[PDB]
Structure formats: C-alpha cells, structure tokens
Amino acid sequence: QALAMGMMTEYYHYIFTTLDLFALDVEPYRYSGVNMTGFRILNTENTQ
Amino acid sequence: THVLRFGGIFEYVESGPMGAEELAFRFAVNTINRNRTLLPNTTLTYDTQKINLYDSFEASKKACDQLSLGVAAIFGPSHSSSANAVQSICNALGVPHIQTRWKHQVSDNKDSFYVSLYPDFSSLSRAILDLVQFFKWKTVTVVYDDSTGLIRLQELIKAPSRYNLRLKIRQLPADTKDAKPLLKEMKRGKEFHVIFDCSHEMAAGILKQALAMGMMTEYYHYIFTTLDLFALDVEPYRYSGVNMTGFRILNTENTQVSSIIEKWSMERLQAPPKPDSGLLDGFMTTDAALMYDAVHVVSVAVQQFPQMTVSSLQCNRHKPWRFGTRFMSLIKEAHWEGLTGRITFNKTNGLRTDFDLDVISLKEEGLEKIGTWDPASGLNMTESQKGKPANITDSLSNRS
Amino acid sequence: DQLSLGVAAIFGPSHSSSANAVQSICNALGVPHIQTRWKHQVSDNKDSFYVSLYPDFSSLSRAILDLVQFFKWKTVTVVYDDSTGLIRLQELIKAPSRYNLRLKIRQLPADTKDAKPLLKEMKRGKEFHVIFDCSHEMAAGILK
Amino acid sequence: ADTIVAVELDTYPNTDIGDPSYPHIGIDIKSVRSKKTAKWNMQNGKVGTAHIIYNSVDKRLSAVVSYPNADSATVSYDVDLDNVLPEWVRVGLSASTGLYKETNTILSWSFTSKLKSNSTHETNALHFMFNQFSKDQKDLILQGDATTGTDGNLELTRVSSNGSPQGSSVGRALFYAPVHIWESSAVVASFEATFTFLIKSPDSHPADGIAFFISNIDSSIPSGSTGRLLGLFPDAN
Numbered sequence: 001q002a003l004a005m006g007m008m009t010e011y012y013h014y015i016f017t018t019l020d021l022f023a024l025d026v027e028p029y030r031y032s033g034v035n036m037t038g039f040r041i042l043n044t045e046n047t048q
Numbered sequence: 049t050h051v052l053r054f055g056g057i058f059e060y061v062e063s064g065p066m067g068a069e070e071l072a073f074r075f076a077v078n079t080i081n082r083n084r085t086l087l088p089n090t091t092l093t094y095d096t097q098k099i100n101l102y103d104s105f106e107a108s109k110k111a112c113d114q115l116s117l118g119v120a121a122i123f124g125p126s127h128s129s130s131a132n133a134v135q136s137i138c139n140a141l142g143v144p145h146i147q148t149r150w151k152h153q154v155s156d157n158k159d160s161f162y163v164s165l166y167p168d169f170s171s172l173s174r175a176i177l178d179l180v181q182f183f184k185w186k187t188v189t190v191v192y193d194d195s196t197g198l199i200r201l202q203e204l205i206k207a208p209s210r211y212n213l214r215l216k217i218r219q220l221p222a223d224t225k226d227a228k229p230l231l232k233e234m235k236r237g238k239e240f241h242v243i244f245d246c247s248h249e250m251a252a253g254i255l256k257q258a259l260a261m262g263m264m265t266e267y268y269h270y271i272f273t274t275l276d277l278f279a280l281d282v283e284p285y286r287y288s289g290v291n292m293t294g295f296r297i298l299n300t301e302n303t304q305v306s307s308i309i310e311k312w313s314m315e316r317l318q319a320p321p322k323p324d325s326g327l328l329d330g331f332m333t334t335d336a337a338l339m340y341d342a343v344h345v346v347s348v349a350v351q352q353f354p355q356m357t358v359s360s361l362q363c364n365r366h367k368p369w370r371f372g373t374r375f376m377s378l379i380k381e382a383h384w385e386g387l388t389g390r391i392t393f394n395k396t397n398g399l400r401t402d403f404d405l406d407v408i409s410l411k412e413e414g415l416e417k418i419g420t421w422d423p424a425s426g427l428n429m430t431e432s433q434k435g436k437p438a439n440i441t442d443s444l445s446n447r448s
Numbered sequence: 449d450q451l452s453l454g455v456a457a458i459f460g461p462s463h464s465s466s467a468n469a470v471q472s473i474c475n476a477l478g479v480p481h482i483q484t485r486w487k488h489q490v491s492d493n494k495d496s497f498y499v500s501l502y503p504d505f506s507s508l509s510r511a512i513l514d515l516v517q518f519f520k521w522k523t524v525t526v527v528y529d530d531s532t533g534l535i536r537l538q539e540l541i542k543a544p545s546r547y548n549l550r551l552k553i554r555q556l557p558a559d560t561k562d563a564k565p566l567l568k569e570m571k572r573g574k575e576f577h578v579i580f581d582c583s584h585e586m587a588a589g590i591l592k
Numbered sequence: 593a594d595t596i597v598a599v600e601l602d603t604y605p606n607t608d609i610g611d612p613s614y615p616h617i618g619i620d621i622k623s624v625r626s627k628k629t630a631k632w633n634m635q636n637g638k639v640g641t642a643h644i645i646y647n648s649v650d651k652r653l654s655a656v657v658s659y660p661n662a663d664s665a666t667v668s669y670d671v672d673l674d675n676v677l678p679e680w681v682r683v684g685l686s687a688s689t690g691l692y693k694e695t696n697t698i699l700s701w702s703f704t705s706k707l708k709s710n711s712t713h714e715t716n717a718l719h720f721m722f723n724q725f726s727k728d729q730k731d732l733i734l735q736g737d738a739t740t741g742t743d744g745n746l747e748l749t750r751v752s753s754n755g756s757p758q759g760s761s762v763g764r765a766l767f768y769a770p771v772h773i774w775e776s777s778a779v780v781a782s783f784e785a786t787f788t789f790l791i792k793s794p795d796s797h798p799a800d801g802i803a804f805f806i807s808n809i810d811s812s813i814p815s816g817s818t819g820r821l822l823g824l825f826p827d828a829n
C-alpha cells in the first residue's frame with residue numbers, strides 16, 4: 001500500500017522495529033530507491 | 049443475390065486463435081451480412097489468407113492467390129515490409145488496398161489505390177506537440193522502441209528550432225524488455241517529463257519496471273503516443289501520484305459504439321492475458337478497431353456503386369481492373385462514423401488526416417477524459433479543469 | 449524473370465521500396481542478393497541471404513559523432529533530406545543524453561531546392577555548425 | 593501591427609485570403625482582405641503607368657493602372673482617411689514574391705500632397721519625381737532585400753539571376769520624409785502618385801504583386817512577408 005501510493009522513493013527511509021525484517025520479500029522494492037533499515041537478532045551467518 | 053468477395057491477409061497464428069485484426073474482419077463481415085438496411089444485396093464473403101507477416105515474397109503470393117480467385121479490396125498485412133509489397137500489387141492490377149496500420153510512405157512512391165485508416169503520425173505529432181505546450185515543458189525526453197519511431201515522431205524531433213523544449217531522445221533496449229539500465233539514466237538525469245513511443249504491450253511492461261525503480265511519483269509525467277492507453281491495467285498506479293496523459297480515438301462514450309466492445313469481448317473466447325502482461329482482459333485494441341472500420345468504409349463505397357462485379361485478375365498478364373478506377377473514388381469520397389469517430393480521407397495521398405482524439409489522463413478514479421483534440425482546432429482542454437481564479441487585487445505596497 | 453532464366457546474384461534494386469521485395473524473393477528461393485545502397489533493415493525481418501556493401505549508418509553516425517567531439521561543438525544542427533534520414537543518424541540524435549550537445553534538427557522542404565526559407569531561419573538562430581545529410585547533388589545546391 | 597493603407601497590384605490570386613480568382617488591382621484598410629478589387633490585365637514585361645489620388649472634395653480614394661494600348665482599372669473606394677491612418681505617415685513602395693518568381697522593377701516614382709494650411713492660402717507640398725534612381729540613392733529608406741542602381745531602375749526583388757528574381761524575395765522602398773494627414777486642418781490632402789513599374793514574364797506565372805502603401809512613420813518587414821502577405825502585412829487579417 002506504500003508502493004501503490006508512490007511513497008517508497010529515494011527520499012523516504014523506514015525503520016522497522018520487527019526482528020523479522022529478513023522474511024520480507026523485498027524483490028519489488030530493491031531497485032526502488034527506498035531505504036529500509038531494520039534489526040535482526042537471528043544469527044544467520046553461523047553455519048551451525 | 050450479388051456476390052462481392054473481399055480479400056484478407058493476416059498474421060499466421062499456428063496453434064492459438066487467430067489475430068485481433070483477423071477476428072475483427074470476420075466480425076465486421078458478419079455484422080453487415082446480418083443487416084439488410086446497410087447493403088440490401090450484398091453477400092460479402094471473405095478470402096482471409098495467412099502469411100508469416102515478415103516475408104514480402106509470401107505476401108505477394110497470397111495477394112495474387114486472392115486476386116486470381118477474385119477480390120474487391122485487399123485489407124493488407126500489418127507490417128512495413130509486406131504492406132509496401134502488396135500495395136504495389138494492388139496499384140498494378142487495380143483493386144484498392146485498405147491499410148489499417150501505419151506505414152512509412154516513401155515520398156517518391158507515386159501510388160493511387162491505397163488508404164490508411166490508421167491516424168497518420170504527422171497529425172498525431174501535432175497533438176503531442178500541442179500537449180507539451182499546454183503543460184509548458186522544457187525538458188522533454190522522447191523514448192521510442194525501434195528505429196522506425198524517429199520517422200513517426202519526426203514533427204516532434206523537429207521542434208526545438210521553433211519552440212523552447214529541449215529534446216533528449218533515447219531508445220528502449222532491443223533483444224530484451226528489461227529497461228532497468230535506461231530508467232537508471234533517466235532518473236539520474238532528472239528527466240521528469242517523458243514521452244514514450246511504444247505499443248501498448250511494451251507500454252505496459254515499461255511501467256512495472258518504472259514502478260519497481262520508484263520512478264512513478266508525484267513529480268513525473270508520461271505521455272504515451274499509443275492510441276490504446278485505455279487497455280492498460282492502471283490499478284497499481286491510480287493512487288501513485290503519477291501523471292499518465294494519453295490519447296484515445298476509440299469513441300467509447302457512444303452507446304452504439306460501446307455495445308460493440310461489449311459484443312466483442314463475449315465472442316472472442318481467446319487465450320487469457322495473465323497478470324504478468326499488465327493488460328485488461330476484454331477490450332478492442334485500436335489495431336482491431338480500425339479493421340472494423342475498414343470493412344464499413346469500403347461497404348459505404350460498394351453501396352454507391354451497385355454495378356460492381358468481381359473479375360479474375362491474374363498477376364503475370366496484368367491489366368487494370370475496369371471498375372478499379374471508379375471504385376477508388378468512392379472509398380476516398382466517403383464519410384462514416386465508425387468506432388474511432390468519423391473516417392474522412394484526404395484528396396491527395398489516402399492518409400487519414402482529419403480525425404478525433406479524446407485526450408485522456410490518469411486521476412484517482414482511473415483513466416479520465418480531460419479534453420478533446422482536433423486538427424482544425426487546437427486542444428479543446430479545460431473540460432475537466434475548472435477555475436483559474438487569478439485575483440490580482442492585492443499586495444497593497446505603494447500607490448505613489 | 450531472372451530467377452527463371454537462372455542467375456547467381458541479383459545486384460541490388462537500389463531503393464528501400466524495391467529492395468524489400470527482391471530481398472525476400474532471394475531469401476525464399478536461395479540466391480544471394482547483393483545490395484549496394486543502404487536500406488532500412490527491419491529489426492524483426494529475419495532474413496540472411498543478402499549482403500549490403502554500403503557502409504552502415506550504425507557505424508557512420510558514430511563517425512560524425514566522433515568529429516563533433518573532436519571539433520568540440522555544442523550547438524550542432526542537422527539538416528536532413530528524407531524521413532528515412534533520421535534512421536541514417538540514429539546515434540547522432542540519440543546523443544545529447546550522453547554528452548552536452550544541443551541537436552536542433554531541421555528538414556529540407558521536399559520538391560524544391562530553396563533553402564532561402566531555411567537558411568534565413570538558420571542565420572536567425574545563430575547556427576554556425578550545420579551537419580547536412582543531403583546527396584551530393586543536393587549538397588552543392590544548398591552550398592550555392 | 594503598424595497601421596497601413598495600400599493599393600495591391602496583386603499579380604497572384606489568393607483565394608484563401610479574399611483575393612479574387614483573377615489578378616487584380618486592390619485597396620487595403622489595415623487588411624490584406626481588400627475592400628474593393630477590379631480586374632487587371634497583367635501583361636508581360638512592359639511598362640507601368642499607375643496613378644493614385646484621394647481628393648477630399650470628393651473623399652474618394654481612387655487608383656488607376658494603364659499599360660500603353662490597354663484599359664484603366666478604376667478601383668475607387670470611398671473611405672474616410674480621418675481616423676483610419678495616423679497624423680504623420682511615411683509613404684513608399686512595396687513588392688514581394690514567393691514560390692513563384694516575378695520581376696518587380698519600378699523605374700520612376702512621384703508623389704504630390706496638398707494639405708490645407710488654410711484652404712486658399714498656399715497649401716503645403718511634397719512633390720518629387722524620381723526618374724533617375726541612382727546607385728546610392730540616399731533619400732530612400734529601402735528595407736528588406738530591396739535593391740537599386742546598376743541602371744535607372746528600382747529593383748524591389750533580389751534580381752540579376754538572368755532576370756529570374758530569386759523567389760521568396762521581398763523589398764520595400766519607403767520615402768524618406770513624413771507627410772501631415774489626419775484631419776486637424778481638414779483632410780483635402782490630395783496625394784498623387786505615378787508608379788511606372790515593369791513586371792517581366794519569368795515563364796513561371798508571374799506572381800505576387802506590387803503595392804503602394806501609406807504606413808506608420810516606423811516600419812519594417814512584418815514577421816516574414818515573402819508571399820500572400822505581399823510585403824507589408826503581419827497577418828492575413
């Protein structure tokens with residue numbers, strides 16, 4: 001609903017307070033210009 | 049009672065249903081065939097042949113294969129390569145050629161026997177050039193799709209010399225539909241006022257790539273030079289902020305017209321335009337709307353000349369078809385309110401030059417008419433716009 | 449007539465309307481079609497039984513683009529002849545986007561040789577860096 | 593737009609803007625759409641004799657043109673020169689062509705105004721008789737692309753392309769000094785002219801007509817006038 005209102009552009013920046021931002025399909029928004037900063041506690045870099 | 053066979057050359061779909069132009073020809077025959085009020089004694093039958101549409105030799109066979117069997121008018125292919133061929137078959141043996149899609153007429157091609165019911169891009173390019181002055185642009189970027197598009201918008205390229213709009217002509221990448229590198233350059237280049245020159249399929253696929261690059265916002269404005277902008281599913285873009293202004297010749301406001309599109313969508317039963325396309329489901333494309341008018345404008349001409357019979361013209365030992373001199377006049381002196389407004393030709397070259405654009409645009413309720421263009425007049429806009437107060441009785445500074 | 453009599457190479461009916469006929473004839477029955485003047489290659493015209501010995505304007509329009517970078521112009525002016533002539537200059541019209549040019553494109557009026565309407569306006573706009581696209585007959589007619 | 597009243601000796605029919613189907617003498621009141629016209633014979637390269645008066649004892653603005661052994665085209669239209677044309681003017685000649693060529697050689701020109709200092713008491717004049725247009729005639733304010741000299745001729749075309757005078761050419765021949773008209777000392781200013789032209793046959797349907805105007809004291813070529821606008825009008829209205 002923020003995409004269809006033309007509101008995810010180069011001069012917006014969204015902070016999500018979810019600890020699950022990694023599970024968002026960000027494929028429609030990767031080239032958009034939008035800044036989406038969040039936090040993740042799930043330590044995915046460890047191979048175990 | 050009296051027989052009257054029309055020709056027909058269309059694209060060869062090998063597995064699916066036939067093309068939108070071919071179904072529109074089969075429809076417009078059957079509509080006139082079941083109504084006696086227009087043309088009491090005609091028994092209009094078709095000779096629709098199919099070519100690969102990119103072969104000027106194959107188009108010359110199926111032109112002669114129809115004309116040896118006997119036709120009255122050949123409704124032509126939709127390419128630039130095949131139409132230049134079949135026109136010279138039609139000019140040689142006599143029968144008129146009825147074009148429904150734009151062709152580069154070579155300026156030194158001395159031909160009678162052709163009319164082009166597609167609205168000619170010389171007169172359309174005034175309507176774009178009038179429209180950019182209404183919005184008072186100075187930073188216009190033309191984006192076309194193939195090298196023929198410089199011919200089509202040539203009256204738009206030829207006008208930083210008279211006016212002050214600064215053109216920055218670009219091209220969509222071929223051998224792909226991924227114009228991500230193009231729209232990176234245009235966004236970085238601060239290009240906020242864009243004129244595409246696309247077919248409505250590629251004008252739909254350019255917007256999903258413009259949406260995913262965050263480029264359809266409140267400070268962009270796109271002019272599409274398609275006459276089929278109405279068939280774009282604009283549902284993802286209606287709330288966006290984007291301005292999408294275009295032209296439409298398809299006179300959908302008339303109920304006699306709008307009944308036909310309603311009758312069109314039911315009788316197709318074709319392959320579904322899946323949501324990866326971006327188009328709406330059942331409409332008449334403006335390529336297929338003109339082929340509906342192609343039958344009627346000739347059907348007006350066969351009404352005024354009832355003595356007309358069909359001969360067996362063979363291409364090798366060719367002679368002019370003796371009715372072909374007379375019958376070409378009644379096509380050119382003809383007027384008919386079809387789906388795309390009135391069809392009036394030009395007494396010189398048979399290009400359709402006087403026509404009726406309805407200028408539509410994008411507001412938050414869908415595509416919406418904001419005026420009307422005409423060649424004789426200018427932009428009759430400010431039909432959706434109302435206001436312009438201009439209260440100059442202010443500022444109180446100093447009398448003297 | 450010539451294919452029925454039997455030839456090896458049809459040497460170029462040398463115009464854009466007349467070439468597209470004989471090219472697709474030669475693609476059909478097989479013999480090589482030796483084009484000797486530039487025509488418009490349609491992008492979806494899947495043919496290859498032809499060669500075209502005129503130097504392509506995909507290369508030439510970069511060469512005129514090389515000179516306007518070498519002479520460092522910024523107020524270039526194209527004067528062409530036919531509506532086909534914008535295809536001859538693809539890369540030249542497409543490059544104020546990539547550089548700082550200000551292409552102001554003008555057309556000679558057809559069926560005449562009077563540049564007296566045109567050159568009156570080109571002197572008016574202070575255009576001194578003209579890029580013509582005439583033939584060699586219509587080159588000297590404008591130079592006079 | 594400058595206020596201007598002219599006598600078009602139009603050698604080309606302009607049916608789009610009100611000129612008749614025949615070439616014609618005309619008359620203009622701020623309009624290329626003529627008040628009154630009449631048929632003019634328009635012979636080939638021959639000579640000249642035109643004559644224009646306006647006597648406010650009869651207030652008829654008349655104009656006649658006659659070749660030798662030809663007739664006379666009286667095209668007299670009553671118009672009130674009180675309000676249609678300013679106090680001070682700058683009369684002269686105007687000629688043009690476009691897309692068809694013609695020669696517009698003027699070879700002699702006169703003028704004679706007489707306006708009422710006090711009707712009997714010795715009215716003013718501006719009589720001149722330019723039979724000998726020189727190479728450096730410095731009492732003409734010849735505008736546009738008008739040429740002169742090289743003979744006794746006033747060539748109001750870019751000429752000497754073997755007399756094929758380089759089509760879409762235009763050249764005006766304004767006289768140097770102003771004339772008092774409006775009313776103010778009322779308007780009996782019986783201005784005369786004699787306007788011996790030469791229009792050579794170019795074998796090309798000779799066309800676009802010579803004029804004789806009474807303009808504003810400031811004037812130039814209006815916005816391009818090579819053609820139907822005949823050398824002195826901005827618009828077709």
Ligand SMILES: *[C@@H]1O[C@H](CO)[C@@H](O[C@@H]2O[C@H](CO)[C@@H](O[C@@H]3O[C@H](CO[C@H]4O[C@H](CO)[C@@H](O)[C@H](O)[C@@H]4O[C@@H]4O[C@H](CO)[C@@H](O)[C@H](O)[C@H]4NC(C)=O)[C@@H](O)[C@H](O[C@H]4O[C@H](CO)[C@@H](O)[C@H](O)[C@@H]4O[C@@H]4O[C@H](CO)[C@@H](O)[C@H](O)[C@H]4NC(C)=O)[C@@H]3O)[C@H](O)[C@H]2NC(C)=O)[C@H](O)[C@H]1NC(C)=O
Nearest residue numbers: 394396397401402605606607608609690691692818819820
């Ligand atoms: C339909 O498609 C059309 C495309 O063909 C297009 O119409 C075109 O519109 C333009 C204007 O936008 C128009 O130009 C005007 O038309 C005059 C006549 O056309 C002449 O000349 C043009 C070039 O200008 C040629 O293209 C024509 O083929 C034709 O040329 C012929 O060839 C000889 C060669 O020597 C000429 O001398 C002859 O004139 C002609 N022979 C014939 C017809 O047998 C053109 O002349 C107009 O110029 C006018 O203004 C000039 C200003 O100085 C004058 O000097 C000049 O003489 C013209 O005045 C008129 O001249 C006419 C003949 O030339 C006469 O009728 C009158 O004497 C005179 N006064 C009038 C009419 O009041 C001007 O440039 C194109 O000609 C026209 N194409 C045509 C008609 O084929 C339309 O946009 C499309 N749509 C519609 C809705 O029509």
Ligand SMILES: *[C@@H]1O[C@H](CO)[C@@H](O[C@@H]2O[C@H](CO)[C@@H](O[C@@H]3O[C@H](CO[C@H]4O[C@H](CO)[C@@H](O)[C@H](O)[C@@H]4O)[C@@H](O)[C@H](O)[C@@H]3O)[C@H](O)[C@H]2NC(C)=O)[C@H](O)[C@H]1NC(C)=O
Nearest residue numbers: 008009010011012013029030031032033034035036037262
């Ligand atoms: C969210 O905000 C961020 C700014 O706070 C944006 O960061 C930008 O991210 C891009 C990557 O998309 C960076 O580009 C990188 O540049 C470095 C080095 O810069 C040089 O690289 C390019 C080639 O890409 C070269 O052509 C130039 O000469 C540069 O000098 C590269 O090492 C990287 O691989 C990557 O290319 C930007 O530098 C960066 N900062 C900006 C634009 O100020 C981020 O993209 C935002 N999210 C969006 C817009 O969706």
Ligand SMILES: *[C@@H]1O[C@H](CO)[C@@H](O[C@@H]2O[C@H](CO)[C@@H](O[C@@H]3O[C@H](CO[C@H]4O[C@H](CO)[C@@H](O)[C@H](O)[C@@H]4O)[C@@H](O)[C@H](O)[C@@H]3O)[C@H](O)[C@H]2NC(C)=O)[C@H](O)[C@H]1NC(C)=O
Nearest residue numbers: 265266285286287288289290291292409410411412413433
């Ligand atoms: C493309 O450009 C158009 C202008 O060039 C945009 O139109 C603007 O957008 C709004 C909302 O869509 C339109 O509002 C409609 O106007 C009428 C009457 O005017 C009302 O406008 C004022 C504000 O100017 C508002 O406060 C009042 O309530 C008035 O009632 C209403 O009847 C409609 O319901 C609707 O409100 C305007 O016409 C226009 N506004 C401006 C400031 O230009 C168009 O939306 C653009 N497309 C986008 C952004 O996607």
Ligand SMILES: *[C@@H]1O[C@H](CO)[C@@H](O[C@@H]2O[C@H](CO)[C@@H](O[C@@H]3O[C@H](CO)[C@@H](O)[C@H](O)[C@@H]3O)[C@H](O)[C@H]2NC(C)=O)[C@H](O)[C@H]1NC(C)=O
Nearest residue numbers: 079080081082083084085086087088302303304305307385
């Ligand atoms: C066979 O075709 C004819 C030709 O169109 C049909 O007759 C006429 O059709 C038109 C179009 O619907 C009717 O025109 C109407 O005009 C009025 C006033 O001008 C206005 O309300 C609309 O603009 C409307 O278009 C016209 O009445 C009608 N004439 C009749 C019925 O006599 C005819 O109906 C067709 N045959 C069949 C069986 O449908």
Ligand SMILES: *[C@@H]1O[C@H](CO)[C@@H](O[C@@H]2O[C@H](CO)[C@@H](O[C@@H]3O[C@H](CO)[C@@H](O)[C@H](O)[C@@H]3O)[C@H](O)[C@H]2NC(C)=O)[C@H](O)[C@H]1NC(C)=O
Nearest residue numbers: 406418419420421422423424425426427428429430431432
């Ligand atoms: C742009 O389109 C509009 C819409 O048609 C044009 O306005 C129309 O102008 C005509 C002029 O004859 C109006 O007709 C007459 O107006 C009176 C006013 O009451 C009416 O009673 C009659 O219908 C009469 O025929 C017509 O009403 C009017 N339509 C409107 C205002 O909606 C306008 O002229 C066009 N502009 C152009 C072509 O430049």
Ligand SMILES: *[C@@H]1O[C@H](CO)[C@@H](O[C@@H]2O[C@H](CO)[C@@H](O)[C@H](O)[C@H]2NC(C)=O)[C@H](O)[C@H]1NC(C)=O
Nearest residue numbers: 049050084085086087088089090351353354355
């Ligand atoms: C077809 O043939 C006859 C020929 O006379 C038709 O008669 C006329 O046909 C014209 C054109 O079709 C109509 O405009 C007239 O109104 C017809 N007049 C009459 C009296 O019919 C007739 O319509 C047709 N007959 C048949 C049997 O199909």
Ligand SMILES: [Ca+2]
Nearest residue numbers: 602606611820
């Ligand atoms: Ca005139």
Ligand SMILES: [Zn+2]
Nearest residue numbers: 600602611618
């Ligand atoms: Zn006149």
